[PDB]
Amino acid sequence: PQNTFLENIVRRSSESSFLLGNAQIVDWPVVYSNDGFCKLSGYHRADVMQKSSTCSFMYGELTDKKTIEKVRQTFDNYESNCFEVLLYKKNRTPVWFYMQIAPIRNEHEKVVLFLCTFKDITLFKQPIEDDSTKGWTKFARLTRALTNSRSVLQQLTPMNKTEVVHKHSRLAEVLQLGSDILPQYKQEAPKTPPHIILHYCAFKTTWDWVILILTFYTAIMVPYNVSFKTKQNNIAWLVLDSVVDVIFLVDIVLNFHTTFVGPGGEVISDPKLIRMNYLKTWFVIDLLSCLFSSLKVVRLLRLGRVARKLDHYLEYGAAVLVLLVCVFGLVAHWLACIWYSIGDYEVIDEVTNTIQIDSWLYQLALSIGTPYRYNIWEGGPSKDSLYVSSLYFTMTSLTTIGFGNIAPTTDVEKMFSVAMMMVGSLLYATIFGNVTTIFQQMYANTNRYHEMLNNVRDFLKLYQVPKGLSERVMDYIVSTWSMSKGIDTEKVLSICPKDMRADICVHLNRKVFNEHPAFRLASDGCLRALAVEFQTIHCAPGDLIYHAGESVDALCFVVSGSLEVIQDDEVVAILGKGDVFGDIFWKETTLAHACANVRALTYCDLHIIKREALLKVLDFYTAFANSFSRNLTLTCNLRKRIIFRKISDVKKEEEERLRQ
Amino acid sequence: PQNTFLENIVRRSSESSFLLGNAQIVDWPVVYSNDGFCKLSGYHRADVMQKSSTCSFMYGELTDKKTIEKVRQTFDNYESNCFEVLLYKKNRTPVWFYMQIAPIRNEHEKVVLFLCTFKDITLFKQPIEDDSTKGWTKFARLTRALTNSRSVLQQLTPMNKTEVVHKHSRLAEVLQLGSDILPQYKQEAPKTPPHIILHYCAFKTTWDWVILILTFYTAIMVPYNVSFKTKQNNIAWLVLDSVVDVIFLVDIVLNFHTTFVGPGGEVISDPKLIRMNYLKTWFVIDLLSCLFSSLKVVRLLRLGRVARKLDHYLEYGAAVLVLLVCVFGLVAHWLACIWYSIGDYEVIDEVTNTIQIDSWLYQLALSIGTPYRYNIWEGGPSKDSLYVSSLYFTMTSLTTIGFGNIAPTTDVEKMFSVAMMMVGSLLYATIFGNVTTIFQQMYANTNRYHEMLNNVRDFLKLYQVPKGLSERVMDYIVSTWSMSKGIDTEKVLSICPKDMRADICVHLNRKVFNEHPAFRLASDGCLRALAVEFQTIHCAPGDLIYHAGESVDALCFVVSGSLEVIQDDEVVAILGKGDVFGDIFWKETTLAHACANVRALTYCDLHIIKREALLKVLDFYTAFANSFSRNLTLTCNLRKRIIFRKISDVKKEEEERLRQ
Ligand SMILES: [K+]
Numbered sequence A, B: 001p002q003n004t005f006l007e008n009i010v011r012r013s014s015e016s017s018f019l020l021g022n023a024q025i026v027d028w029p030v031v032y033s034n035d036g037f038c039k040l041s042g043y044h045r046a047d048v049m050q051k052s053s054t055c056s057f058m059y060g061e062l063t064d065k066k067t068i069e070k071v072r073q074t075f076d077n078y079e080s081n082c083f084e085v086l087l088y089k090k091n092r093t094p095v096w097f098y099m100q101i102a103p104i105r106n107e108h109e110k111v112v113l114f115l116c117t118f119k120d121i122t123l124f125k126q127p128i129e130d131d132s133t134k135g136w137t138k139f140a141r142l143t144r145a146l147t148n149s150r151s152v153l154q155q156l157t158p159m160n161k162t163e164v165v166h167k168h169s170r171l172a173e174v175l176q177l178g179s180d181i182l183p184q185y186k187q188e189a190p191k192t193p194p195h196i197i198l199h200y201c202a203f204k205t206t207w208d209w210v211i212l213i214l215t216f217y218t219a220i221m222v223p224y225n226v227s228f229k230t231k232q233n234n235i236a237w238l239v240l241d242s243v244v245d246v247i248f249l250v251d252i253v254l255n256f257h258t259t260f261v262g263p264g265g266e267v268i269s270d271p272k273l274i275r276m277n278y279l280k281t282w283f284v285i286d287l288l289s290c291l292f293s294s295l296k297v298v299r300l301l302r303l304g305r306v307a308r309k310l311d312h313y314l315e316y317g318a319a320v321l322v323l324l325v326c327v328f329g330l331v332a333h334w335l336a337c338i339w340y341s342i343g344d345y346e347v348i349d350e351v352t353n354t355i356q357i358d359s360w361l362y363q364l365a366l367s368i369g370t371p372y373r374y375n376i377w378e379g380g381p382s383k384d385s386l387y388v389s390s391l392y393f394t395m396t397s398l399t400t401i402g403f404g405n406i407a408p409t410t411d412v413e414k415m416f417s418v419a420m421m422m423v424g425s426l427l428y429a430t431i432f433g434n435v436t437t438i439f440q441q442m443y444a445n446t447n448r449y450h451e452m453l454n455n456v457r458d459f460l461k462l463y464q465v466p467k468g469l470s471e472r473v474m475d476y477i478v479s480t481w482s483m484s485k486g487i488d489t490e491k492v493l494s495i496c497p498k499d500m501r502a503d504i505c506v507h508l509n510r511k512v513f514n515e516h517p518a519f520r521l522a523s524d525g526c527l528r529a530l531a532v533e534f535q536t537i538h539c540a541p542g543d544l545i546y547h548a549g550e551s552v553d554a555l556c557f558v559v560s561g562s563l564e565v566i567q568d569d570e571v572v573a574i575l576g577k578g579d580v581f582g583d584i585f586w587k588e589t590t591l592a593h594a595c596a597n598v599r600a601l602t603y604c605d606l607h608i609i610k611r612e613a614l615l616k617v618l619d620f621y622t623a624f625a626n627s628f629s630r631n632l633t634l635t636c637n638l639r640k641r642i643i644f645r646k647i648s649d650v651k652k653e654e655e656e657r658l659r660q
């Protein structure tokens, strides 16, 4: 979804000087000056910007009020028009320009920008100049300014006293340019010429899958027909063949209206390029469909046609596992057809009309009951058994089993099997390479976890760690792997750019920025800066976050669970579900001593922001800092010591005063 | 083991205002104010805390001494009671509350906390207000304060002059709430309703293993019975079948009382959820046990039942190796039954009552002696050989051996073998993928060590390192791998949180913190800070720790071995087993020059703390620093130079003075 607006203008402009300017703002500031205008006015792209789009910076002592007021009028109410004006220049050279102001609309018509293409007009207007010594200077300037117009612009029929081919020639062209140069400032989708099919839409996927199914059908049924010679059932076989041929011819026709991915870019919806690519690349697939052994053998290239697109159907995983079986079952059938052809060529030696006793069909006939009889030689084994018995041998020879009850024994079957045993070995090797790689990839996820467990267990057993810490660590590892199985936030957020990483971080800490008063009057540009520093810890029962002597250097927000603040072995605070605890960092500038042990009572979730990062963010946006200071009150400040007196001490003091 | 206390209170409270407060401390400071109390009193969770739990901050000019003294009394001796009081508010609005003070006990009864649930009472009491202009304000306030009580609290039979349904309704309810809201402030274990079986306890493991054994037995013995038709021995076969069926029915019944692990949490001991899950998921296993070929074929799903739990029996290692054999031996038996059924269907062609000569049972009968006889056709091969001969063929066809003395030859055995050779190939591929991955995982530990040895050897051979350093490095690598085989402290301690890492580090350096006077008066919060910085080195004989010019910047504690401090090629100190050597860092602030070579005499163990870390820790806890300075005396200070005179120099001087 591109917002291509600066490309539609230039490619239909042919070296213009368009001067897009903002329309909603008063005085219509210029927003983009084309390089063409950088030479037609002598101004660089440093002072045309932020000035009025009405071209009020090119005025002087010669501009007339016949159109300037009209220019302001046509800018007031949004309407295209074709005024003409006399303007000065950076070098103080008065020349005439042909204004072509025209509005440009948004997704919903709002007139956002004002296209203001200029055009030099000096030959076609009466020269006027004041600071000139001789009258030939302006006449020379006529040709000097309009050099491009002397060749192709307005020289179709060059002569004198023909100004009428200059005023009305493009007077009303602005409406004729409504489709040429007046695009829509919209988030456009990939646009295509009429009757062009995109390769990404949800229509070509169904055709791709249908072509895959039909290619498998043809690969299965063509060698069988050209090897096991069968007649035509007409109503159930001829119809299917004709329908498949028509479907593939329609596919060839529709292949002229696809969109190929560019070699160094994205979709190229140019019909000429598509046709050139199809001419250069793939009439091999056109030959096969259009109009015997040879015809079907060349029809078999349709499988190569469907294998060309082996990128949308296939992924690296279970898809390869399915493909490696679907191709094995096809090789075992092609070889089963070739083997039957070889074993049927040599049975009846037609030179002398005798049966060869060292073939494989005759010995199969001897071990199945049905013999061969002489009438010509009559039939032997049935046609429904000559295929099972011929796929059996191929399947034994490809899986390296080799029962050897059907074996090559004449002279040529031994020549064919030598070739079979090479392609079978190669296929077997490729299959057992691919399956090993696929299984390694699949199970590589649960190998790191077990390796980590083994390393931790060996570490805890080698150094004789006590049972308590050993079991605690062993439980912690399992707990962390039970909710973050393989996924690590650091690496995933490392491969993302600076923009969306902030959005992901803001989303992750959505339960501290929403349900907490402090993060209420906060700019988005500051939330995206705080959310990067917010970490997260997953406490467990009995775990201590701050001990009795550690330095409090992190503000913690509890989002799920409960904590216990114990001081002098006395409970003094029970935090839970939306209570902040820590130290006031912005107003103290000194690290403190945690005067109380914070111990978890339930599986807790805390979001921690370090002292340094919080101070750095609060030292930059010194507008949110005041709201943060005045809106965040800590439920348990771990710097102030709470002094109290247990009842036991009071009772002891009373007893002591009772004694004396 | 969770300490869930704040969850039991709320879920049986139904929007209360409980005000847990400490009991041991005098004046009973509040420890946790519920959000419900944040609106019934106008106070936020910033000033109710640390104040008295007797609600002494909500007093004023209208509180009566009829119960305040009684409130202090009931707080003195720990006993629940149900006083009622008139209290003020943050907005100075006097309203009546119903106190429900009740103590809460620890693991051993100690009365730790005081539950003080409040309840607004304004409609049910006579209004009293002083700073009011009109008498209708208090009457309106009656309804304003008690808005929740007008719907469901005390409006079962709403009428007038019915205050008796408000005093005695909940006067003694505190004892009736002893099981409702008065939990135990204990480290609780997972609690379950009566007659509920946990899936983690040591009882369900035995049932799981018994079910596994019985499923293997059924998988072995069902296809044999439904294929090799055998009669009933009654006393030894029917009894086992009935017992197994009863055991599995009992298992189905007991499956209603299990605890499934939550999708996003831990154990869910809710009977309704368990029943809903079992209804939604696994009556496929219920169908099979309850009430021929089809019945046993559907009984075979019990193997799928036991395969559902394939997470507790199995790990990634030798367990998979055992499973891949136990499933191969089962596939080779299921196919051995199917093959015998196929080969027994076609032997006797009952249409014409003749033996088919191209089967596999007849040819087996011809190659074993026993023929088939006609009486109907009488018996042939024995029943104890028809299974061995049928498992032989399957085992040859699955291991890709294929002796081919029993081979498929009729019409259908060739159709069955084509299907066998696909499942066998798939099983073989999966087995040889899993075994390769398992062996790679197992031997990946001893590959890094050999790679390190090879790299070190090649480095020492390429650069022509002298023999001395080469042998020393080669011995050092082996020595380090002989006690730290694969385990590295850095990575193992990297995946642990900040809490237990300190405990592990303290445990590792247990021989410097225990047997040394300096680390005697040290807080735990400082030991956990020093132990993180203590490194460890493993010296070897002849190794030098400090040379004659290096900068002493590390305090070293010897924990095992002996050292030698040589100065001017003279022994001046022999450290060993509990002697510290280094430089006084805290009182000098200048790096020095090691004026003596420290050389190891035996395989030593030193624990080293760097200068910067020691200074940083000693600059924070400026209470342990004084004890460290006054209690640590170095046995060999490597900054002061010991000046002496060898006897050789004295003898030379005496000889020189003798000459002249
Ligand atoms: K093999």
Ligand SMILES: [K+]
Pocket: A400, A401, A402, B400, B401, B402
């Ligand atoms: K073989």
